[PDB]
């Protein structure tokens, strides 16, 4: 009516246009949107993961990681960190769905960024390195070889010439079938002439280049098949008169990395430079997850810097994989990474887990964080928020025994389960909690508004045992005392005894008068001081007061 | 009412929720899911209710409640029943903010009002409200969020359009004017400081100009840097802003219902995210 | 905490001992009757306070002045218990 014009005017001073919604955060970091299906009139929308991985809902994967990392209690801040990361990429070959090319991503990191196993001994430190070089190379090339296997046979059916069948059965590596048709094309030197996988010879390099150059002279029908044979043979599979950047479809980019890696001369020039030597001619996929692994292998010490670049564009280094890579190798100091990129990957990852709704899996990611402030206060804040996730499995109690200074989750329980109905239940488990201090006058803001008990000499002797918890607490500077808190304990000695006290016995009418200069929080903490006056009549003469409601305070109690 | 809802904010536990409206009440609807449960309807107000906030828990859960009439009602459960234990009514005009101090700091509710005033409610020794009157904006102070530790600190949002940062000193006893910001040209709605768990705070200082200017501090000792959520006037006008406890993700709902999960990426681009 | 400016063993003890005499003068003045019920706005602390027990407060508070034995000699003359200190130091 006029309440239309009124409401208008108020939200001129709020300046709101009338049609209000809001989005808030709850306690698991998810949204609360106004939708009139709620009984508040708001309903919770559970926020979804930045990147979905299947084994960030797998408890086994998390507890494996705990047991494959060196947990410290950090010397600066006891709240737990990680000294050294003994992570491996074969931890994710226990887990991950096995038909994603994620499994392929995990597989590829295992061969490169976790180094070969060495079962040989050497007598020279020049062959020490060569044997580790060949071992990683065949590993590398056997994984490539299986994943080009179909792609080799496609280009077998996209050709038809007999030298093509010899040439391409050599790359799919089946020498006994390679020379079979070489007998029927009339060859005894081209039947094998692709076979340099562990052979380096500088002479045939020369042969392959001269062979190109005689054919160029104008006219004559010269084989462009024998020219690919002598392209692989020259030691330089692009340069010359003929080239493999004119084959954009009679080989794939992935077969081409293999051609540079084994027919650039495996051991005459290093591995990773020839990986980079492919990535000059061609720029690899950002959306095939295995393409990116060979870029960040093409880059050695600029792995950290290619990560920041590929990331400006589409990601296949998306936040789980980069997290795993940087946090293995920056603790190790084998591949360099910036400590600031370390911090962004870690932090970003804890966000995705808090869309995953797991407080513990996040708590463990704060451990890799070694900024002393962040890995103090992220740990505190998690624990007092959602206590309830942290108790639920025995994986959860190994999150609760990183080097948790268990007791911390118990000191957040008695802050959590506290409510105003059962204030006294958990302020009791601050008192009897017995790792606390300053619960000594806090029990007095529960048991002052209801000095109701169960009022026998077993509850009162039990309440003796409760004011001895007071002295169990550590003793503070200028705080902690028991010379006015034994007031309520010398009360439990004049309530099992009759004897009129002129303070021949007690500090308790004095103790009430101190308790009308003490009462702090609440004026029913001041009026209980008036109620405990009344429960002790003929045992005092009332130099305090008994407890608008006047009609019957009783002004006669003296003798 | 529950259909032109203007606030619904939870406690730090996330188990208790208090929703207000144009109902002239505070219908307490705690979180049991998308079902919530009435415990009491608190009548004490006259006129539209704007903001409530439960206490941060180390000094109870204690519901303030600010409203048209002039009144901030301190409600507290005391022996399983409620009782308005103080009244904090030192204002005449529309009271527009109530936000408790976080339980990294002590008992310091922050009341703000478009009468010109901020009021730093000092809880005395029976819970007896006593404010020190300060001014931030002299058209009216429409909002007031706290700055926790990513001494005491807060932020207020202008009806003068300025977003003034306020920082406590104990040799002058009040909030020293730390700095003054302005990229705004119609009035501020909500000034939301981020609770990041590390050195970083962005401030989505929400404005009526159909724009929200995200001031950014990359680390706290980096300065306030002008960036925009997007670099155009929005079709409609923009409402309540929040920042997460861990991740620092923006969340706002628009007039057309612009869902916002646009967090600042590497490249410095407020980038859509989960 | 702003009657502390030296914050050490003896700075605690001064302010401590101030309250020991200030409770007990009102008691003494209740014998001599300068305390009544028109003589307060706040009920009087007619508890007598003990010297040695508030020294055990001080001692546990500052093990930074337990390393100064002279600061321990200082304590013991206000206790007035000179053989006991001299027997603990041989």
- Check if C2 contacts A (Cβ < 8 Å): no
Q: Taking CB atoms and an 8 Å cutoff, what residues of chain A touch C62?
A: 477
Neighbours of A550 (CB within 10 A): 5
Q: Does B36 touch chain A (CB under 8 A)?
A: yes
Rounded CA gap, A402 and A392, in Å? 16
Q: What's the resolution in A?
A: 11.6
Half-sphere exposure of A233 (CA within 13 A, CB side): 23
Q: 3-class secondary structure for A34-99?
A: ECCCCCCCEEEECCCCCCCCCCCCCHHHHHHHHCCCEEECCCCCCCCEEEECCCCCCCCCCCCCCC
A516: left (phi over 0), alpha (psi -120 to 50) or beta: alpha
SS3 call for A371: coil
Write the burial class of residue A13 (CB in 10 Å: 0-12 exposed, 13-18 middle, 19+ buried): buried
Cβ separation A475–C42 shorter than 8 A:
no
Q: B153 — phi, psi (to 5°)?
A: -155, 150
Q: What are the chain A neighbours of C14 within 8 Å (beta carbons)?
A: none
Picking from A475, A507, A511, the nearest residue to C60 by CB comes out as: A475
Which of A29, A373, A524 has the CB atom closest to B246's CB atom? A29
The C-alpha atoms of residue A182 and residue A192 are separated, in whole angstroms, by 9
Question: Do B158 and B137 meet the contact criterion of CB atoms below 8 Å apart?
Answer: yes
Please list, in sequence order, all residues whose beta carbon lies within 8 angstroms of the beta carbon of residue A186, skipping any fewer than 6 positions away: none
Specify the 3-state DSSP secondary structure of B225. strand
Q: How far is C47 from chain A (nearest CA, A)?
A: 5
Contact B73, B87 (CB under 8 A): yes
Q: How far is CA A401 from CA A379, B143, C78, in A?
A: 13, 42, 50
Q: Looking at chain C from residue 8 to 27, which residues have their Cβ under 8 Å from any Cβ of chain A?
A: 12
Into how many domains does chain B fold? Answer: 1
- Do the Cβ atoms of B203 and B192 come closer than 8 Å? yes
Task: Report how far apart, in Å, the C-alpha atoms of C81 and of each of B203, B220, C73 are.
Answer: 64, 57, 10
DSSP for A107-174 reads HHHHHHSSPPP-----S-TTHHHHHHHHHHHHHHHHHHHHTTHHHHHHHHHT---HHHHHHHHHHHT-
Written as six digits, the tokens of A392 are 């639920």
d(CA B53, CA B10): 7
Phi/psi for A362 (5° steps) reads: -60, -40
The DSSP line for B71-112 is -EEEEEESSSSEEEEEEE---SS-EEEEEPPPTTS-SEEEEE
Burial letters A110-136, b for 16+ CB under 10 A, else e: bbbbeebeeeeeeeeeeeeeeeeeebe
Q: How far is A355 from chain B (nearest CA, A)?
A: 8
Instruction: Return the H-helix or E-strand segment holding B226.
Output: strand B225-228
- Which two tokens mark A444? 């007095």
d(CA C56, CA C24): 20
Nearest to A448 by CA among B198, B4, B78, B232: B78
DSSP track, A426-481: HHHHHHTT-S-SS-TTTSHHHHSTT-----SHHHHHHHHHHSSHHHHSPPPSS---
| Sheet-wide strand order for B36-43 | B7-10, B17-20, B25-31, B36-43
- Do B and C touch, counting CB pairs below 8 Å (3 needed)? no
- Give DSSP secondary structure letters for A496-543: S-----SSSS-SSSHHHHHTTS---S-SSTTTHHHHHHHH---S---S
Cα dihedral A170, A173, A175, A177 sign: negative
CB contact under 8 A, B247 and A32: no
Other Cβ atoms closer than 10 A to B35: 12
Helix pair A423-431, A407-416: axis angle to 10 deg: 150
The DSSP element (H or E) to which B215 belongs, if any, is strand B212-217
Cross-chain CB nearest to C45 (options A478, A481, A510)? A510
* Boundaries of domain holding B192: 3-274
Q: How far apart are CA A28 and CA A24, in angstroms?
A: 11
Residues 6+ apart with CB under 8 A from A239: none
Here the CATH number for the domain that contains residue B155 is: 2.130.10.10
Interface contact flag, C43 A511, Cβ < 8 Å: no
Token digits of residue A385: 């928020």
Report the alpha-carbon distance of residue A263 to residue A251 in Å, rounded: 15
Q: Going by C-beta distance under 8 Å and a sequence separation of 6 or more, which residues neighbour residue A166?
A: A178, A179, A181, A182, A185, A187, A190, A191
Tokens representing residue A283 in the block: 């720029």
Residue B57: partners with Cβ closer than 8 Å, 6 or more residues away: A415, A418, B11, B12, B13, B103
Q: How far is B176 from chain A (nearest CA, A)?
A: 26
The closest of B60, B65, B90, B62 to B76, measured between CA atoms, is: B62
Query: If DSSP codes are grouped into helix, strand and coil, which group holds residue B14?
Result: coil
d(CA A231, CA B165): 70
Tokens of A547: 């407890």
Three-state SS at A101? helix
CA distances from A73 to A59, A82, A405, A435 (A): 23, 8, 8, 20
Q: Decide if B253 and A34 are in contact by the 8 Å CB cutoff.
A: yes
CA distance B236 to B152: 35
C44/A511 Cβ within 8 A: no
Query: Which DSSP category does B63 fall into?
Result: B
Residue A376: its H or E element: helix A374-385
Q: Which residues contact A259 (CB under 8 A, 6 or more apart)?
A: A232, A237, A244, A251
Q: At what angle do helices A303-310 and A339-353 cross, to 10 degrees?
A: 50
List CB contacts of A265: < 8 A, sequence separation 6 or more: A196, A200, A235
Q: Which chain C residues are within 8 Å of A540, Cβ to Cβ?
A: none
Rounded Cα gap, residues A116 and A141, in angstroms: 13
Q: Are strands A31-34 and B225-228 parallel, antiparallel or unpaired?
A: unpaired
- Helix crossing, A162-172 with A149-157: angle to 10°? 180
Q: What is the 3-state secondary structure (H, E, C) of A288-302?
A: CCCHHHHHHHHCCCC
CA angle A264-A267-A270, nearest 5°? 80
CB contact under 8 A, A14 and B189: yes
Long-range contacts of A328-337 (CB under 8 A, 24+ apart): A328/A85, A328/A87, A328/A88, A328/A89, A328/A113, A329/A113, A331/A82, A331/A84, A331/A85, A332/A84, A332/A85, A335/A113, A335/A300, A335/A301, A335/A303, A335/A304, A336/A301, A336/A303, A336/A304, A337/A303, A337/A304
Distance (Å, whole) CA B110 – CA B64: 10
| Chain A CB contacts of B246 below 8 Å | 29, 350-351, 354, 362, 378, 381-382
Rounded Cα–Cα distance for residues A255 and C27 (Å): 101
Per the listing, tokens 């009144």 go with B71
Cβ-proximal residues to A7 (8 Å cutoff; 6+ apart), any chain:
A18, B22, B48
Cα A541 to chain center, whole Å? 67
Rounded-to-integer distance, Cα A520 and Cα B126, Å: 6
- Does residue A207 contact residue A233 with C-beta atoms inside 8 Å? yes
Q: Which chains touch A (3 or more CB pairs under 8 A)?
A: B, C
What does the alpha-carbon distance between residue A521 and residue A427 come to, in Å, rounded to a whole number?
15
B212 backbone dihedrals φ, ψ, rounded to 5°: -130, 125
Q: Specify the residue for token string 């009339």.
A: A186
Q: Is there an interface between A and B (3+ Cβ pairs < 8 A)?
A: yes
Give the list of residues 6+ apart from residue B16 with CB closer than 8 angstroms, or none: B10, B30, B31, B54, B61
β-sheet bridge partners, residue B135: B117
| Secondary structure of residue B243 in the 3-state scheme | strand
Alpha-carbon separation of residue B236 from A20, A166, B188, B189, B252 (angstroms): 11, 69, 15, 14, 13
Q: Classify residue B199 by burial, with Cβ atoms within 10 Å: 0-12, 13-18, 19+.
A: middle
C-beta atoms of C47 and A478 within 8 A: no
The C-alpha atoms of residue B207 and residue B184 are separated, in whole angstroms, by: 7
Please report the DSSP string for A12-39 in residue order: HHS---S------B-SSS-EEEE-TTSS
- A and C: touch, per 3+ CB pairs < 8 A? yes
Q: Cα angle at C23 between C21 and C29, to 5 degrees?
A: 95
B-chain residues near A20 (CB < 8 A): 4-6, 239
Cα angle, residue B40 at apex, residues B35 and B41 outer, rounded to 5°: 95
CA-CA distance, A524 to A22, in Å (whole number)? 39
Residue B67: in which H helix or E strand, if any?
A: strand B64-67
C-chain CB neighbours of A483 within 8 Å are 47, 49-50, 53
**Which of A476, A477, A513 shows the shortest C-beta gap to C46?**
A513
Q: Please provide the DSSP assignment of B151-214 as one string.
A: --EEEEEESSS-EEEEEE-TTT-SEEEEE-----SS-EEEEEE---SSS-EEEEEEESSS-EEE
Q: Is the C-alpha dihedral spanning A31, A34, A36, A39 positive or negative? A: positive
d(CA C57, nearest CA chain A) in Å: 8
| Contact indicator for B24, B44 with CB cutoff of 8 Å | no
Residues of B with CB below 8 A from A41's CB? Answer: 2-3, 5, 8, 19, 21, 29
As a whole number of angstroms, the distance between CA A147 and CA A166 comes to 20
Report the C-alpha gap between B68 and B45 in whole angstroms. 8
Q: Give me A402's structure tokens.
A: 């990183």
Pairing of strands B117-122, B131-135: antiparallel
Out of A476, A478, A514, name the one closest to residue C45 (CB).
Answer: A514
Whose tokens are 């002239």? That residue is: B24
Q: Which residues in chain A touch residue C4, judged by CB atoms under 8 angstroms apart?
A: 478
CA distances (Å), origin B175, targets A95, A140, B102, B136: 55, 64, 17, 10
- What tokens does A382 get? 């998690």
**Long-range contacts from B147-153, C-beta under 8 angstroms, 24+ separation:** B147/B193, B147/B201, B148/B102, B148/B104, B148/B105, B148/B193, B148/B195, B149/A377, B149/B104, B150/B194, B150/B195, B150/B196, B150/B197, B150/B198, B150/B199, B150/B200, B150/B201, B150/B220, B151/B105, B152/B101, B152/B105, B152/B108, B153/B178
Chain A interface, best mutation among B10, B13, B140, by max A CB count within 10 A: B13
Residues 6+ apart with CB under 8 A from A9: none
Which of C42, C46, C61 is nearest residue A510 as measured by Cβ atoms? Answer: C46
Angle (nearest 5°) at CA A266 between A264 and A271: 100
Cross-strand pairs, B177:
B166
For the purposes of burial, counting CB atoms within 10 Å of the CB of A249, is it exposed (0-12), middle (13-18) or buried (19 or more)?
exposed
Give the Cα separation of A140 and A148 in Å (integer): 13
């Amino acid at each position: 009516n006029d309440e239309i014009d009124n409401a208008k005017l108020i939200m001129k001073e709020r300046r709101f246009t009338a049609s209000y919604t809001f989005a808030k955060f709850s306690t698991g970091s998810m949204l609360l949107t106004k939708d009139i299906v709620g009984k508040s009139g708001v309903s919770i929308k559970r926020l979804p993961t930045e990147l979905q991985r299947k084994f960030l809902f797998d408890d086994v994967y998390l507890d494996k990681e705990i047991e494959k990392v060196t947990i410290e209690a950090r010397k600066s801040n006891p709240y737990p960190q990680i000294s050294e990361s003994s992570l491996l990429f074969k931890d994710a070959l226990d887990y991950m769905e096995k038909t994603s090319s994620d499994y392929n991503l995990w597989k590829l990191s295992s061969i490169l960024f976790d180094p070969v196993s060495y079962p040989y001994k050497t007598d020279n430190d020049q062959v020490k390195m060569a044997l580790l070089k060949k071992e990683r190379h065949c590993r590398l090339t056997s994984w490539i070889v299986s994943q080009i296997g179909p792609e080799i046979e496609e280009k077998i059916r996209n050709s038809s010439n007999e030298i093509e069948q010899i040439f391409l059965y050599l790359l799919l590596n089946d020498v006994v079938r390679a020379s079979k048709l070489a007998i029927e094309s009339k060859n005894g030197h081209l039947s094998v002439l692709i076979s340099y996988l562990g052979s380096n010879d500088p002479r045939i390099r020369d042969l392959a280049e001269l062979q190109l150059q005689k054919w160029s002279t104008g006219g004559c029908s010269i084989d462009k098949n024998i020219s690919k044979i002598y392209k692989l043979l020259s030691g330089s599979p692009f340069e010359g008169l003929f080239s493999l950047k004119e084959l954009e479809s009679e080989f794939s980019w992935l077969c081409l990395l293999n051609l540079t890696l084994c027919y650039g001369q495996i051991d005459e020039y290093s591995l990773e430079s020839l990986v980079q030597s492919h990535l000059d001619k061609f720029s690899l996929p950002y959306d095939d997850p295995i393409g990116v692994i060979f870029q960040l292998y093409a880059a050695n010490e600029n792995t950290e810097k290619l990560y920041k670049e590929v990331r400006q564009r589409t990601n296949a280094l998306d936040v789980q994989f980069c997290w795993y890579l940087i946090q293995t190798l920056r603790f190790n100091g084998t591949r360099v990474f910036s400590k600031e990129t370390s911090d962004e990957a870690t932090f970003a990852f804890a966000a995705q887990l808090e869309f995953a709704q797991l407080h513990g899996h996040s708590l463990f990611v704060s451990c890799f964080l070694n900024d002393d402030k962040a890995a103090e206060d992220t740990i505190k804040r998690l624990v007092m928020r959602e206590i309830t996730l942290l108790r639920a499995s025995t994986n959860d109690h190994i999150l609760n025994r990183l080097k948790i200074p268990s007791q911390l989750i118990f000191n957040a329980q008695a802050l959590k389960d506290r409510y105003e109905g059962n204030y006294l239940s958990e302020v009791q488990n601050l008192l009897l909690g017995s790792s606390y201090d300053l619960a000594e006058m806090a029990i007095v803001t529960s048991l002052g508004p209801r000095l109701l008990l169960s009022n026998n000499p077993v509850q009162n002797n039990e309440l003796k045992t409760l004011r001895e918890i007071l002295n169990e607490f550590p003793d503070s500077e200028r705080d902690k005392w028991s010379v006015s808190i034994n007031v309520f304990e010398v009360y439990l000695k004049l309530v099992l005894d009759n004897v009129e006290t002129q303070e021949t016995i007690d500090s308790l009418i004095s103790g009430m008068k101190i308790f009308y200069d003490q009462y702090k929080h609440c004026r029913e903490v001041a009026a209980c001081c008036n109620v405990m006056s009344q429960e002790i009549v003929s045992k005092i003469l009332e130099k305090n007061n008994p407890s608008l409601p006047l009609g019957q305070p009783e002004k006669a109690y003296l003798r | 009412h529950n259909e032109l809802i203007h606030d619904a904010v939870l406690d730090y536990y996330g188990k208790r929720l208090a929703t207000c409206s144009s109902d002239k009440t505070i219908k307490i609807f705690e979180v049991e899911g998308e079902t919530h449960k009435l415990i009491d309807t608190l009548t004490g107000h006259e006129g539209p209710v704007w903001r409530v906030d439960w206490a941060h828990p180390k000094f109870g859960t204690i519901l303030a409640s600010c409203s048209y009439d002039g009144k901030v009602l301190i409600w507290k459960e005391e022996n399983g029943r409620w009782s308005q234990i103080a009244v904090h009514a030192v204002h005449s005009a529309s009271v527009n903010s109530v936000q408790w101090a976080p339980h990294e700091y002590g008992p310091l509710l922050l009341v703000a009002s478009s009468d010109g005033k901020v009021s730093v409610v000092e809880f005395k020794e029976n819970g007896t409200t006593s404010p020190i009157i300060i001014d931030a904006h002299a058209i009216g102070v429409n909002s007031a969020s706290w700055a926790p530790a990513t001494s005491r600190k807060f932020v207020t949002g202008g009806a003068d359009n300025l977003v003034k940062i306020w920082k406590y000193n104990s040799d002058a006893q009040t909030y020293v004017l730390e700095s003054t910001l302005e990229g705004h040209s119609d009035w501020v709605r909500d000034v939301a400081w981020s609770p990041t768990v590390l050195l970083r705070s962005y401030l989505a200082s929400v404005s009526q100009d159909r724009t929200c200017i995200i001031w950014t501090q990359d680390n706290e000792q980096g300065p306030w840097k002008k960036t925009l959520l997007k670099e155009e006037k929005f079709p409609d006008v923009l409402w309540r802003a929040s920042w997460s406890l861990s991740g620092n993700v923006l969340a706002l709902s628009g007039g057309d219902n612009k869902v916002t999960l646009w967090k600042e990426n590497l490249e410095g681009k407020w980038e859509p995210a989960g | 905490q702003e009657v502390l400016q030296y914050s050490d063993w003896e700075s605690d003890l001064h302010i401590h001992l101030n309250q020991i005499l200030q409770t007990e003068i009102e008691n003494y003045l209740l014998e001599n009757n300068q305390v009544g019920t028109d003589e307060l706005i706040l009920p009087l602390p007619s508890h007598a306070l003990t010297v040695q027990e508030v020294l055990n407060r001080v001692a546990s508070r500052h093990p930074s002045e337990s390393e100064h034995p002279i600061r321990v000699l200082m304590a013991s003359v206000i206790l007035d218990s000179l053989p006991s200190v001299i027997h603990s130091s041989v």
